[PDB]
Design a protein around this nucleic acid. Structure first.
Length: 62
DNA sequence: GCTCAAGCGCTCTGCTCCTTCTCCCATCCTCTCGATGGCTATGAGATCAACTAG
């Protein structure tokens, strides 16, 4: 039952939550992906400070 | 009978045991199922601050 047509999802400035102005959840609600603690961890190891700021502040909830 | 002792109870850690208390338990993603959610009136008095004239 795993048809790719039900797994593809992309987000570009869609709806945001009400408690926090962060992107919604679930492709059904046009929500973005979660840049979690391990992702920030790997970006820290990279040293991409500007990319980390863009992901966690600029592209999430300015 | 005149000074070193022997004890002595009281206090100060302290040492270990037992008990109690707070936190903690990978990431991301999809879907459905259920629960939830509140909606007295109508009138009476009385004050007050802003228009509308004087």
């Amino acid at each position: 039952k795993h048809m790719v047509d039900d797994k593809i999802h992309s987000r570009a400035r869609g709806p945001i939550q009400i408690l926090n102005r962060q992107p919604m959840e679930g492709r059904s609600r046009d929500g973005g992906l979660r840049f979690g603690e391990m992702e920030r961890d790997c970006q820290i190891a990279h040293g991409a400070a500007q990319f980390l700021r863009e992901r966690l502040f600029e592209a999430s909830d300015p």
